[PDB]
Amino acid sequence: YKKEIGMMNLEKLIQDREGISSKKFPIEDKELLFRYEQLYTGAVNDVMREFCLLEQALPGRIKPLREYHSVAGFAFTVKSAPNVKIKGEMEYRTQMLDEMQEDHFVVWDTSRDDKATLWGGVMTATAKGKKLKAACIDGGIRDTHQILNADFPVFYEYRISNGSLGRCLITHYQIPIKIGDVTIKSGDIILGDIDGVLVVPREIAYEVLLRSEEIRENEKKI
Amino acid sequence: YKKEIGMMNLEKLIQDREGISSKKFPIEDKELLFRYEQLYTGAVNDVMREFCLLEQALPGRIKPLREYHSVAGFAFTVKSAPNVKIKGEMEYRTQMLDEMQEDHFVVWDTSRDDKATLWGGVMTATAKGKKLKAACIDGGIRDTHQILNADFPVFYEYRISNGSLGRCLITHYQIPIKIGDVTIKSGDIILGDIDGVLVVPREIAYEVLLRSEEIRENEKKI
Amino acid sequence: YKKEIGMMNLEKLIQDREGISSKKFPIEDKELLFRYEQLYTGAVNDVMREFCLLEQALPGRIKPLREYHSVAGFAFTVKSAPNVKIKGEMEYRTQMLDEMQEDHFVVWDTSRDDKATLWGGVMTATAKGKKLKAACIDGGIRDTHQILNADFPVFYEYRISNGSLGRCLITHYQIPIKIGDVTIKSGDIILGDIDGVLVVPREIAYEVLLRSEEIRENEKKI
Amino acid sequence: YKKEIGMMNLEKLIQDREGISSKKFPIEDKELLFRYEQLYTGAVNDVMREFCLLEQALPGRIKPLREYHSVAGFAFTVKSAPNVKIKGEMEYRTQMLDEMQEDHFVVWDTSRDDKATLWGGVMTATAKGKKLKAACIDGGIRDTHQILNADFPVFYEYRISNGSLGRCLITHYQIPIKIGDVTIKSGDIILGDIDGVLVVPREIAYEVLLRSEEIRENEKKI
Amino acid sequence: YKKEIGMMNLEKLIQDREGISSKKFPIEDKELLFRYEQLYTGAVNDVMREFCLLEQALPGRIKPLREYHSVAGFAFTVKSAPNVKIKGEMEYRTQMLDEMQEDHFVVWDTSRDDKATLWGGVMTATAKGKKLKAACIDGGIRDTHQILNADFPVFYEYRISNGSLGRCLITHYQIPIKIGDVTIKSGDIILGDIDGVLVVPREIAYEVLLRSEEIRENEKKI
Amino acid sequence: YKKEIGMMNLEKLIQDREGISSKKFPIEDKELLFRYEQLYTGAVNDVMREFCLLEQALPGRIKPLREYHSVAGFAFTVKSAPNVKIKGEMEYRTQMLDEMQEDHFVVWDTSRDDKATLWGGVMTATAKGKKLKAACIDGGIRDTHQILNADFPVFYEYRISNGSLGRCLITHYQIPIKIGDVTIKSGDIILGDIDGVLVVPREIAYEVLLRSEEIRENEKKI
């Protein structure tokens, strides 16, 4: 069964699922992020309803470590799963850390891991030093005293003392991932605040920003 | 099959489930609420055990937005469910808002909706202006910065940025509803604090109050 | 807040979610259904992957009462939710039954009701007399001896003896509904067999049929 | 805190929860059971709705091992929970088996145990020899080849090969138990068939029987 | 079937599951606890990985009432389950309270009770007076205003106003219990902080302490 | 943080988790499997209790497609997870199929995938041609008509028509995996029947067989 794939017509599907938008914005990247941070997630969420997008929020199990005001960044996706295997990983993890840059917003698909943590004090200190914006973990975190002391926004599901080593393995990073109902791609605009994490597709990020600001200004006057 | 309903004897069931108590209290409504707010929910819960009522608390998934002291009000019930249909609703929603009065305590059955919110900044500002006591949502809330700034007690399950429009529809209000194990009827005494939300049937609300105060005074002396 | 809806641009969303396809097929309706019944659900599922549709199957909790071969029909959608209210309903239910016609495939959204049943012996006998194709209930069924004796395909979640009266209420029918990840609209082609229930959007039903038959013939020769 | 219990008025609660009905029936016990076995569980369920009883069915997770016709018996309640402790138990188990008599219907509350089984080949052979009617286990069973060969009706949740020894312990038997929404007391009439298990309180069992038979005869003529 | 147990060889299993370590430490008990309280749970968790122990943390559903720094104590295990039976209990409860001593850390297996609470204001005041270290409840708590005012560390799952009386019963205490993936025995070292509760087997508690301190000192220098 | 791993002592952990037993049996492989197929899973499960092994059964969500008698094979482990990424996989899948040999028993960890299937008609026909014994999928299957016609034992969780392509990706095979509470390694003896799937560690497989046969013979005489 290698002729079965050739019997299929998957070119349109591969482009739809694995295609990444290299679209440039009419404004600077930091200006785009700063202007998004002047909006609530609910307001941006309602705007994307007008674009017929109803499943852009991370699931309700995701909660912020503090009652944050809006923080915006560009998606850096990570994919892991519970795994008994221990060896390896350094090749994936060390290469992954080198690709994390300033203004990245980590979005981590843990394959619904409920036993271990994927983000702790070392990851937080590394992300702070690289000037990342925040991290959204669909799973466990630990070393929360160190995380709080670092003043680094973190969105998570639960907290436990079990480490990742010997319990999970990273399999991919900077690929499209799916958490809850929303698909996240590298470079998407990620917005998080007191009411969770929101995903804005990069192709409409500038248009969604202008529409959200336009709604915000009309509400004050009306 | 319209003779099947006539073949049934449902008069006793309809009165038991849909019957509303129009009982008046020997004291003023605001005095009843104020005296209930001098009691912990656990103390009132134990008293209703003596009335053979073991399922009067909202389920443990309900949590307060702040570590509230006791807040009491009269139940204003709302019923919604996830729904793809968008149009309509204004007839239900505008009529519903007009019936919300001072000292009401909103109890919202969302049909276990886990994707959208039913209570946000607009509902909170509306409830504050009408001098409602609190709101208990078996589901999602958003605009939490606005909710906290309004100093309005809110009990909820989760937080997410998805709005209700296009994801849920209100089907009924001011009818008997069931959340978890407890049935809530309009006019029931609703008590909420740091340990969740409690339902006191209106027919025994005054007797439960006197018994709870009597227990409270005997504990101090013994 | 009635100017807020006028401040929104929801025309595109309403058409996308509530729009129904009145597309006619190049073949007779019964020929379309019969040709779909010569295909497995997995084969039709793989074809819609080529259309970039990955969430067209009813959730895995849906199981067939018997190990059926493929049965196809046109979607008749029903929406209900758990409800304490008893009175009314006849207006909704009697009008609903009159609209069920030959070759309809009932798809019932129960709002994840886990306490009562929505389909029993009376509904089955009614559906058999009207020459419906099958029924898919995202919830409970009962009178299974009568259902099996009627030779009527039924897909369901669980079985329990609690009836719908006094525990649930129908709120809508023949509207778009959402069960699991898939949205079902009236007139969609519904295909069910031993491996669950599948939804084919009416707008591509004829093209999906030809592609599925083309794949089936190429597999035999290769 | 031993004066706190004396400060409470729990006599009414203890009688309501722990009181057992010693009511005799106007007919023989075996005639009562045989006449109940001529009715479907859904029909008896609807009759108890007229008695304002809406939560008399075992939860939908309970399923029959075979598509049984109606089997009726008198409730023999058992209570266990997952437990690491191994020693003891014989005092509880041997005394428990001696109290199982003819026409008993075992209803087993396992405290939602999902790791081990409470009913296997030895219990089935013991129940067959004592002429019990059936067994309803809110948990796991095993030795299913032996159970099927014994022709003994069994209602259960799941099947697994883990035994009870070293994983669970029986703590009580012949006491009131609660499974799902229904409370079961010793001597209650237990009815099970293809659509699950149903509980009829002993105090109304004869009146429910006459009403169910009356409904059944009126349906045939109308 | 009393020869079946004699046919089994369970001596090794009984010693493994019910055996309690009476090992003495080379240092004072309070010095062992104080030195453990200078470590984070994640650091001690990683050390026990070197001992091939990967399931020593309480499940992620356990959360602290406050963002505690490390608190350590010796395990006092309690086992309860939901139960309709009310009478008795005083014999178990009064004897249980007398055995709670200074520096005990209560670990309570509630058999996954989701309806009632096992720890409130009276238990907290009793534990404070006996100089217990903390309490970990795999279930509900109430009287949280009193708990917070007592400055007593509490780890829990949810909060609700339903009391234990009439809804649960204690069946055992000071026996081996299992919560989530971890087995807890009396005398085990229990460590809790902002990231949950951790179990250190008493037999390796001193060796785990020295290794954790050795790792901590090497990290500062490297 | 590459010195942190060198600061750890993980050699004992890696050998415990990733070590594979190359132990040879005193009898032929097919004789070992045939003699295991003369035993029920519950009997072998009880024997491993004497070895202090209480978590050797696959979780209760695993069910057989037919009421099988005992089938035994050597574990061939597979690991996958839900994934949006489509490309690749052939390198993993084609190499994986070449390593499947006669008398293998596939045990598939899907990372709790609830949306897609991992085993269908093509995998079944491939496994039949290679003379595999059975397949245990902790997830979805499809093409069940083809599976039943092939007379190939299959243990699974649910059935759905969604294929694996575009919804999951295989990441590892022939590594240690963990499903539920049990860890499965390549070469372990896998036993499945009407009551689920059981894992016998290869190091004790021959001793467990002799003890199980000894118990079986003593039961007939006593």
Q: Do B52 and D218 touch (CB under 8 A)?
A: no
SS3 B207: helix
**DSSP of D155-211:** EESEE-S--STTTEEEEEESS-EEETTEEE-TT-EEEEETTEEEEE-GGGHHHHHHH
Structure-solving method: X-ray
Rounded CA separation B217/B219 (Å): 5
Interface of C with F in 23-52 (CB under 8 A): 40-42, 44-46, 49
Q: What is the resolution of this structure in A?
A: 2.1
Max CA separation in chain E (angstroms): 64
d(CA D140, CA D162): 9
Contact E122/D at CB under 8 A: yes
Is the Cβ pair B9, D50 closer than 8 Å?
yes
Q: Which helix (H) or strand (E) holds E91?
A: helix E90-99
Task: Compute the C-alpha angle F122/F167/C193, nearest 5°.
Answer: 55
Look at strands B71-82 and B168-173 and give their pairing.
antiparallel
- E:123-152 residues touching chain B, CB 8 A cutoff: 140-145, 148
Residue in chain B nearest A192 by alpha carbon:
B161
**Chain A interface includes F20 (CB < 8 A):** no
Burial of E42 (0-12, 13-18, 19+ CB in 10 A): buried
Residue with tokens 């079965």: A4
Q: Which residue, D158, D153, D78, D76, is CA-closest to D110?
A: D78
Residue with the two structure tokens 């590459």? F2
Our measurement of the distance from residue A180's CA atom to the centroid of its chain's CA atoms, rounded to an integer in Å, reads 12
In this structure, are strands D196-200 and D189-193 parallel, antiparallel, or unpaired? antiparallel
Contacts 24+ apart (CB under 8 A), A131-134: A131/A102, A131/A103, A132/A73, A132/A76, A132/A100, A132/A102, A132/A103, A132/A104, A132/A105, A132/A106, A133/A33, A133/A71, A133/A72, A133/A73, A133/A103, A133/A104, A133/A105, A133/A190, A134/A71, A134/A73, A134/A105, A134/A106, A134/A190, A134/A192
* F175 lies within 8 A of chain A by CB: yes
Q: Is the dihedral of CA D91, D94, D98, D103 positive or negative?
A: positive
Instruction: Find residue A75's DSSP bridge partners.
Output: A105
The DSSP call for residue F58 is P
Interior/surface letters C102-122, b for 16+ CB within 10 angstroms, e for the rest: ebbbbbbbbbbbbbbbbbbbe
A61 is in an annotated binding site: no
CB atoms under 10 Å from CB of D94, counted, come to 11
Helix (H) or strand (E) holding B14: helix B11-18
Helices D41-50, B11-18: inter-axial angle, 10-degree rounding: 70
Tell me the shortest Cα–Cα distance from F84 to chain A, in angstroms: 6
B10 and chain D: CB distance < 8 Å anywhere?
yes
Task: Give the gap in angstroms from C-alpha A70 to the nearest C-alpha of chain F.
Answer: 28
CA nearest to B142 within chain A: A195
Q: Identify residue B35 by its one-letter amino acid code.
A: R
Q: Chain E residues with CB inside 8 Å of B198's CB?
A: 161
**In angstroms, rounded to a whole number, what is the distance separating the alpha carbons of residues F108 and F123?**
12
Contacts of E8 by beta carbon, 8 Å cutoff, 6+ apart: D165, F46, F49, F50
Report the distance separating Cα B116 and Cα B84, nearest Å.
12
Nearest of C120, B19, C163 to residue D48 by alpha carbon: C163
Subunits next to E (3 or more Cβ pairs <8 Å) are A, B, D, F
Three-state SS at F78: strand
- Residue linked to tokens 């010569």: C38
C219 touches chain A (CB under 8 A): yes
Work out the angle at residue E127's Cα, subtended by the Cα atoms of residues E126 and E133, and round it to the nearest 5 degrees. Answer: 170
Are E161 and B41 within 8 A, CB to CB? yes
Chain E residues within an 8 Å CB radius of D126? 1
* Token representation of residue E139: 């279930």
Residue C181: closest C-alpha in chain A:
A181
Chain interruptions in chain F, by residue before each (C–N > 2.5 Å):
none
CB D76 within 8 A of CB D107: yes
CA atoms within 13 A on the CB side of E201: 19
Count residue pairs from D and F with Cβ separation < 8 A: 62
Residue A79 and residue F79: Cβ atoms within 8 Å?
no
* Residue whose C-alpha is closest to residue E79's, from E91, E96, E62, E65: E96
Q: Which of D80, D47, D50, D42 is nearest to D192 (CA)?
A: D42
* Distance of alpha carbon F180 from alpha carbon F59, whole angstroms: 5
CB burial of residue F90 (10 Å; 0-12, 13-18, 19+):
exposed
CATH superfamily of C1-222: Ribonuclease E inhibitor RraA/RraA-like (3.50.30.40)
Q: What are E30's two structure tokens?
A: 């309070």
- Would you call E25 helix, strand, or coil by DSSP? coil
Tokens (6 digits) for B211: 């018994």
What's phi and psi for F145, nearest 5 deg?
-60, -40
Tokens 């606005």 sit on residue: B146
Where on the phi/psi map is residue C89: left (φ > 0), alpha (ψ -120 to 50), or beta?
A: left
E174 — contact with chain D (CB < 8 Å)? no
Task: Name the residue of chain E whose CA is nearest to A145's CA.
Answer: E194
Residues facing D106 on adjacent strands = D76, D135
Residues on chain C touching A8 (C-beta within 8 angstroms): 46, 49-50
Chain B neighbors (3+ CB pairs < 8 Å) = A, C, D, E
**CA dist., res. A81 & res. A96, Å (int):** 16
- Say how far apart CA B168 and CA B166 lie, in whole Å: 6
Q: Is E54 on the interface with A (CB under 8 A)?
A: yes
Q: Which structure tokens are listed for B10?
A: 């449902």
Rounded CA-CA distance D43/C9 in Å is 51
| Residue B197 main-chain phi, psi, to 5 deg | -120, 140
| Cα–chain center distance at D8 | 32
Every domain of chain D and the residues it spans? 1-222
Beta-ladder partners of B108: B78, B137
The helix (H) or strand (E) run that includes residue F205 is helix F205-221
In terms of C-beta density within 10 A (0-12 exposed, 13-18 middle, 19 or more buried), how is residue D129 classed? exposed
Contact C215 A7 (CB under 8 A): yes
Binding site for substrate, residues of C? 120-123, 142
Nearest CA in chain F to A176: F84
> Which residues neighbour E101 within 8 Å (Cβ) at sequence distance 6 or greater?
E130
Spell out the residues 6+ positions from residue E124 whose beta carbon is closer than 8 angstroms to its own. E135, E143, E146, E147, E150, E152, E154
Assigned token pair, E198:
């951790």
Residue B37 is given by DSSP the state T
Tell me which residue of C157, C133, C146 sits closest to C69, measured CA to CA: C133
CA dist C221 to A8, A70, C217, D194, Å? 15, 59, 7, 45
Interface test with D, best of F52, F69, F195, F219 (most D CBs within 10 A): F195
